[PDB]
Design a protein around this ligand. Structure first.
Ligand SMILES: Nc1ncnc2c1ncn2[C@@H]1O[C@H](COP(=O)(O)OP(=O)(O)O)[C@@H](O)[C@H]1O
Lengths: 49, 49, 48
């Protein structure tokens, strides 16, 4: 019926076009986009202020 | 707590205690190789390739 | 052993029912055990 959550992941060689299709879905579905890298962080406070 | 489909609905952060309601958000994740991600986290989302 | 976590689950399920009422289709959601996995998704743990 309504939208439902689920988590999903993409993986493959760098530069395959991953993020570009991500944004393409954001404008496909019409939802708002916002990228957020989290590589190598350990300061949990950034995720919670 | 973020990625749990149910507990995002009452996400809270140290600054403003009041729960937020993320339930409609569509999280997505990108990893160059899917295996390095710790097992409890990798196990929820599907690993599309 | 505490009941707080079940209280959160049933809360989420209820609020989704509220979302099905206030804007959704049904005027009276009718939860059934077979239905529940719809609302809260598939069971995660099973193999006690
Ligand atoms: N099928 C495709 N069509 C058009 N552009 C592509 C395609 N695949 C990859 N690209 C381009 O390659 C780049 C890869 O970027 P992206 O997926 O956004 O992040 P990453 O660089 O991590 O893959 C983008 O500039 C994108 O336009």
């Amino acid at each position: 019926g309504s939208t439902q959550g689920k988590i999903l992941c993409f993986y493959g060689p760098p530069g395959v076009g991953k993020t570009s299709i991500a944004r393409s879905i954001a404008r496909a579905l019409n939802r708002e986009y916002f990228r957020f890298s989290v590589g190598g962080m350990t300061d949990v406070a950034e995720i919670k202020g | 707590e973020l990625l749990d489909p149910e507990q995002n609905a009452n996400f809270l952060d140290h600054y403003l205690d009041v729960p937020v309601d993320l339930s409609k958000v569509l999280f997505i994740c990108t990893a160059n190789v899917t295996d390095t991600i710790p097992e409890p986290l990798r196990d929820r989302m599907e690993m599309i390739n | 052993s505490g009941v707080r976590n079940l209280q959160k689950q049933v809360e989420k399920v209820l609020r989704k029912s509220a979302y099905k009422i206030v804007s959704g289709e049904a005027e009276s959601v009718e939860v059934t055990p077979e239905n529940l996995q719809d609302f809260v998704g598939k069971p995660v743990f099973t193999v006690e």
